[PDB]
Design an enzyme around this catalytic site. Structure first.
Site, mmCIF file in Angstrom:
data_model
loop_
_atom_site.group_PDB
_atom_site.id
_atom_site.type_symbol
_atom_site.label_atom_id
_atom_site.label_comp_id
_atom_site.label_asym_id
_atom_site.label_seq_id
_atom_site.Cartn_x
_atom_site.Cartn_y
_atom_site.Cartn_z
ATOM 1 N N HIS A 66 66.321 -54.626 35.694
ATOM 2 C CA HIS A 66 66.887 -53.922 36.840
ATOM 3 C C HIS A 66 66.521 -52.444 36.811
ATOM 4 O O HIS A 66 66.266 -51.840 37.859
ATOM 5 C CB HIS A 66 68.401 -54.104 36.861
ATOM 6 C CG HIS A 66 69.099 -53.262 37.882
ATOM 7 N ND1 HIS A 66 69.951 -52.234 37.541
ATOM 8 C CD2 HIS A 66 69.071 -53.294 39.235
ATOM 9 C CE1 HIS A 66 70.419 -51.670 38.640
ATOM 10 N NE2 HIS A 66 69.901 -52.295 39.681
ATOM 11 N N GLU A 69 63.271 -51.858 38.382
ATOM 12 C CA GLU A 69 63.290 -51.902 39.840
ATOM 13 C C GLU A 69 63.363 -50.499 40.430
ATOM 14 O O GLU A 69 62.592 -50.151 41.332
ATOM 15 C CB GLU A 69 64.468 -52.749 40.321
ATOM 16 C CG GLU A 69 64.469 -53.024 41.816
ATOM 17 C CD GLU A 69 65.807 -53.528 42.317
ATOM 18 O OE1 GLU A 69 66.721 -53.719 41.489
ATOM 19 O OE2 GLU A 69 65.947 -53.728 43.541
ATOM 20 N N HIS A 70 64.292 -49.678 39.936
ATOM 21 C CA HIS A 70 64.441 -48.325 40.460
ATOM 22 C C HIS A 70 63.197 -47.489 40.188
ATOM 23 O O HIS A 70 62.702 -46.784 41.074
ATOM 24 C CB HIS A 70 65.674 -47.659 39.849
ATOM 25 C CG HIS A 70 66.973 -48.207 40.350
ATOM 26 N ND1 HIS A 70 68.061 -47.407 40.619
ATOM 27 C CD2 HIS A 70 67.362 -49.476 40.621
ATOM 28 C CE1 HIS A 70 69.063 -48.156 41.041
ATOM 29 N NE2 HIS A 70 68.666 -49.415 41.050
ATOM 30 N N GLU A 139 67.785 -41.201 36.332
ATOM 31 C CA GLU A 139 68.302 -42.418 36.949
ATOM 32 C C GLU A 139 69.572 -42.904 36.265
ATOM 33 O O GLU A 139 70.402 -43.564 36.900
ATOM 34 C CB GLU A 139 67.238 -43.516 36.922
ATOM 35 C CG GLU A 139 66.377 -43.577 38.170
ATOM 36 C CD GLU A 139 67.147 -44.049 39.387
ATOM 37 O OE1 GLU A 139 68.305 -44.489 39.226
ATOM 38 O OE2 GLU A 139 66.598 -43.981 40.506
ATOM 39 N N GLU A 146 76.497 -47.020 40.249
ATOM 40 C CA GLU A 146 76.447 -48.329 40.889
ATOM 41 C C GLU A 146 77.299 -49.346 40.144
ATOM 42 O O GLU A 146 77.831 -50.278 40.758
ATOM 43 C CB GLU A 146 74.998 -48.809 40.981
ATOM 44 C CG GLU A 146 74.834 -50.179 41.617
ATOM 45 C CD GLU A 146 73.380 -50.575 41.780
ATOM 46 O OE1 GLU A 146 72.499 -49.781 41.385
ATOM 47 O OE2 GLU A 146 73.117 -51.678 42.301
HETATM 48 ZN ZN LIG Z 1 69.845 -51.266 41.735
#
Ligand SMILES: [Zn+2]
Ligand SMILES: CCCCCCCCCCCCCCCCCC(=O)OC[C@H](COP(=O)([O-])OCC(O)COP(=O)([O-])OC[C@@H](COC(=O)CCCCCCCCCCCCCCCCC)OC(=O)CCCCCCCCCCCCCCCCC)OC(=O)CCCCCCCCCCCCCCCCC
Lengths: 462, 92
Positions: A66, A69-70, A139, A146
């Site tokens: 994941h 992904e960013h 990040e 999140e």
């Molecule tokens: Zn995400």
């Protein structure tokens, strides 16, 4: 001789047979390309479907998939963060991505003329992304936030907890985001290791749908996806172990979050390629769904669905705010069950009524109920294949799961010959007297015992 | 003395050790469970409650009869020479 016996009996409409073909090609390096042309469209969707996810993380670095992904949208060697964002905006296109336990997807939507420029952008960010150590640390603040918002969407939290307790002994139980301590100690070396071990040519499909030409999409892919490594095998041909299903419960009691409880129950299911997968889709539709604040034009008290009818008539007032059945397939196992929300004092009634409906599949389901469920399933599935995105998702998902796309006519032929006696056979084999797993949250004082739920999978009558 | 004494009571060290022993992932009786599962008694006689009850009444009828017959034989063997049928009466 009566006109009432000369009705038009057309099982499968002719439109099911007169569909445009889905063309496929395999390139020398192993990349697979698949396309279906829909002439009545001016736009198109192109994307890349990859056979990797959180299940392919390591226990020590769960969450890198994941994280990657960013970072894929933070810069390349030939394009920066600002330059990438502006190029997409200037074409009016869209670019999206998501990551799950076994599949990862990147896709774009744009006009026909802008399709080549989309393929160039997709290959670049997937093969030439710069994972700058300075951006990896920035990040970490956007992802820890999140994790707090995800904790506010309760349905997503409950299904994660259901995977955690059911698949304790397998990577299929890992969460997608990963633990907090892993997010805080993440480095660019952990992310590069995930890439070099998972993103290969035998695990990637390029799919498109719309005003698209197959031969031209095969030449763009051959040119821009050439620098993709091929799989390396060290003379190791060992098979993967099937995940073990643990019957267990994981409950979070909390009397300081309102009067509504949330619960989910699950059974061990079947994998994609199972000869019984179509029947599980149907069994999911027989149990169905219900919302108290959105019944429609059919009142729940007079519904044809027996489960809805019994729930709505309980204590003359109704015992559920909402419930829904689900069926999820993976490569080597599956998960079948239901989710529900309910009042504190109604929880026991609600859970036991829905269990009663699943166990009815093994004993007493009628052909009226089967044919009602078939009609609803067909309306939803065949209705969702309208846009180019939904079609492209159907191409890519099926190429990874089945190795091919099933034509509409074949699915309808397999669904047609399933009657009530075949439902009983499959439920008796997999669901009758079987292990269950449970997850819950909220005011749970009246929750049934795990053993109560376990023995509700069979009846003593009959 | 720690046993029974409210001023000193505590487990000895050899009991604390027994609580730390571990037999995780071991099952010495597994070969017995495999044999039972290979007879398919569950699939044909115990999964359905109607058949389960047929099994109860039928097996109980036959077992009760064999149990009585066996106990009568033991009774006759232990008591050989003392029961009526073992000593014929002779008339004068
Ligand atoms: Zn995400
Ligand atoms: C001269 C001497 C002669 C004496 C002879 C007398 C007779 C002796 C009978 C011996 C029976 C032994 C076997 C017991 C099993 C009971 C049934 C069972 O499995 O229950 C499961 C039942 C449901 O199981 P589950 O796990 O919840 O759900 C599984 C499925 O999902 C659920 O799936 P489902 O939804 O399909 O199932 C729903 C469930 C329905 O579940 C319910 O809603 C509840 C069911 C009621 C409880 C179970 C029946 C036993 C209750 C004992 C009552 C005794 C009263 C004593 C009064 C004496 C007055 C002198 O279905 C049923 O079980 C229906 C009943 C079956 C038909 C009737 C046969 C069983 C009756 C047993 C005897 C009772 C009557 C005797 C009256 C004596 C009067 C003189 O379990 C319970 O309800 C839990 C508590 C059960 C307690 C059992 C106590 C047994 C004691 C029996 C002896 C009777 C005493 C007689 C005294 C005589 C003195 C003179």
């Amino acid at each position: 001789v009566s006109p009432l016996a000369r009705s038009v009996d057309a099982a499968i409409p002719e439109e099911a047979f007169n569909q445009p073909p889905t063309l496929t090609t395999t390139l020398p390096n192993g990349i697979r390309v698949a396309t279906q042309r829909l002439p009545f469209h001016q736009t198109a969707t192109v994307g890349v479907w990859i056979d990797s996810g959180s299940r392919y993380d390591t226990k020590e670095t769960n969450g890198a998939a994941h994280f990657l992904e960013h970072m894929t949208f933070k810069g390349t060697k030939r394009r920066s963060r600002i330059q990438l964002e502006q190029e997409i905006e200037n074409m009016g296109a869209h670019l999206n991505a998501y990551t799950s336990r076994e599949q990862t997807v990147y896709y774009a939507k744009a006009f026909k003329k802008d399709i080549p420029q989309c393929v160039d952008i997709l290959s670049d960010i997937l093969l030439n992304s710069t994972i700058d150590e300075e951006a990896v640390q920035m990040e970490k603040h956007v992802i820890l936030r999140e994790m707090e918002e995800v904790e506010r969407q309760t349905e997503e939290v409950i299904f994660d907890r259901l995977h955690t307790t059911a698949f304790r002994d397998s990577p299929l139980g890992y969460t997608i985001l990963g633990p907090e301590e892993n997010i805080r100690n993440m480095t660019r070396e952990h992310i590069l290791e995930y890439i070099n071990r998972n993103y290969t040519s035998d695990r990637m499909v390029v799919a498109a749908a719309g005003d698209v030409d197959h031969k031209e999409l095969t030449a763009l892919v051959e040119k821009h996806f050439a620098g993709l490594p091929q799989p390396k095998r060290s003379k190791i041909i060992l098979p993967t172990e099937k995940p073990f299903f643990c019957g267990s419960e994981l409950l979070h009691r909390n009397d300081d979050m309102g009067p509504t409880a949330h619960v989910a129950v699950g059974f061990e299911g079947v994998p994609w390629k199972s000869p019984d997968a179509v029947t599980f889709m149907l069994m999911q539709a027989i149990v169905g769904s219900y919302r108290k604040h959105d019944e429609g034009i059919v009142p729940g008290k007079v519904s044809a669905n027996a489960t809805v009818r019994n729930v709505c008539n309980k204590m003359t007032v109704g015992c559920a705010d909402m419930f829904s059945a689900f069926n999820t397939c993976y490569s080597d196992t599956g998960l079948f069950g239901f989710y529900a929300q309910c009042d504190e004092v109604a929880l026991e009634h609600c859970v036991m009524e829905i269990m009663f409906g699943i166990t009815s599949l093994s004993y007493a389901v009628t052909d009226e109920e089967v044919e009602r469920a078939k009609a609803q399933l067909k309306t939803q599935l065949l209705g969702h294949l309208d846009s180019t995105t939904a079609v492209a998702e159907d191409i890519g998902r099926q190429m990874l799961a089945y190795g091919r796309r099933m034509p509409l006519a074949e699915f309808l032929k397999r669904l047609e010959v399933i009657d009530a006696e075949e439902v009983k056979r499959v439920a008796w084999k997999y669901l009758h007297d079987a292990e269950v797993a449970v997850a819950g949250l909220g005011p749970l004082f009246g929750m049934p015992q795990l053993i109560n739920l376990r023995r509700a999978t069979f009846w003593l009558r009959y | 003395i720690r046993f029974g004494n409210p001023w000193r009571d505590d487990y000895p060290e050899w009991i604390w050790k027994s609580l730390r022993v571990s037999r995780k992932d071991k099952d010495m009786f597994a070969p017995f469970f495999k044999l039972l599962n290979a007879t398919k008694l569950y699939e044909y006689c115990l999964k359905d409650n109607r058949r389960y009850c047929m099994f109860v009444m039928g097996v109980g009828l036959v077992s009760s009869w064999m149990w009585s017959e066996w106990w009568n034989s033991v009774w006759r063997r232990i008591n050989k020479g003392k029961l009526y049928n073992d000593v014929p009466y002779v008339y004068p």
